[PDB]
């Protein structure tokens, strides 16, 4: 059971993402098993770098969404307040395949 | 370069999509080398059937945000009117890897 | 200051949100003259009426992210484990009119 | 019946948001009756300028999805790209009052 967790961060708060990126992924590295895909969205232009970071989004597996809440509430980003969106949505892979 | 684009159906609007499902996966058919991870967002429950469908995630390359909103404004489900939200981010994989 | 606070409710839940629907507007209560519009997100059709709510929007008073950041945590709704999206905004009136 | 409108500006975009912001307004113009609430959303800080706008969020009255759809299509902001974001939802204001 598949779940897209959407998360974008406050505007003008790069530099708590930058605070807490080592903790968040410290977070991650247990659970790096059920991550599918992974990575931050990024803002203006066509850099890749750190800080182009404006948000977290994950597909990650789950038992339940009592699971992803607690793996929502539980990330350091969560609890430092870096972000002003949440948007988690059940879903699959396309059967035939894009 | 890749961008995240998650498209949420309107209420009441399931056999919209269920009309226009061959025409959009025909649609997708030609792009299919672009996009990286694609599939429907789902309901409640644990269903993952036709009727469990509530929208279409896809992680896309494209090499412009021009292209991205073509793409987007030609899908037979958007000309069908089946969508109430559309998120569109620019995006890149985890670099360590989760 | 105003902020925008829209949240959407998980697929399946609508008995969630009656079951707890009491104790948000008592929630609420006390802070109603922050609040300048409030009321349900609605799904399919035209009716107005409680099983067609589907969510909580409002724009409200605060004098800080971090007191947003709170009166979402300590919602009964929220606490409930009610939402799959949350979005916050900070926001003005237009002004001219609209 | 009344819809929430939501719509948030790409990165980058603020001048395009500018260049486009008298049309934007002469769009509307028209429809003032049917505009209950209406503004644009802010980034960082505590400005309300120009500078500081965001996106665009508007409580409207329709007569049906299909015009709501022509409404956000028609928009010289839409027209021009401006969006990364469009959410849509049918709403009522809270039956006690918050
Ligand atoms: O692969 C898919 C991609 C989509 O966009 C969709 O809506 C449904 C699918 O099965
Ligand atoms: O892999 C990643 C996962 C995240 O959630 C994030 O925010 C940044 C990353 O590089
Ligand atoms: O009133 C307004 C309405 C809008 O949609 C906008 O973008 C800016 C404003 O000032
Ligand atoms: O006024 C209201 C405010 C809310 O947040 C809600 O969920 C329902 C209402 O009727």
């Given at each position: 059971?598949?779940?897209?967790?959407?998360?974008?961060?406050?505007?003008?708060?790069?530099?708590?993402?930058?605070?807490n990126?080592?903790?968040?992924?410290?977070?991650?590295?247990?659970?790096?098993?059920?991550?599918?895909?992974?990575g931050?969205?990024?803002?203006?232009?066509?850099?890749?770098?750190?800080?182009?970071?404006?948000?977290?989004?994950?597909?990650?597996?789950?038992?339940?969404?009592?699971?992803?809440?607690?793996?929502?509430?539980?990330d350091?980003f969560?609890?430092?307040?870096?972000?002003?969106?949440?948007?988690?949505?059940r879903?699959?892979?396309?059967?035939?395949?894009?």
């Amino acid at each position: 059971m598949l779940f897209l967790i959407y998360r974008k961060d406050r505007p003008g708060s790069l530099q708590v993402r930058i605070d807490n990126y080592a903790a968040h992924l410290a977070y991650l590295e247990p659970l790096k098993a059920k991550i599918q895909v992974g990575g931050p969205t990024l803002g203006a232009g066509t850099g890749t770098d750190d800080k182009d970071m404006t948000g977290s989004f994950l597909i990650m597996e789950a038992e339940s969404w009592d699971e992803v809440h607690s793996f929502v509430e539980n990330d350091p980003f969560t609890k430092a307040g870096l972000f002003a969106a949440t948007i988690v949505e059940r879903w699959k892979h396309g059967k035939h395949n894009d």
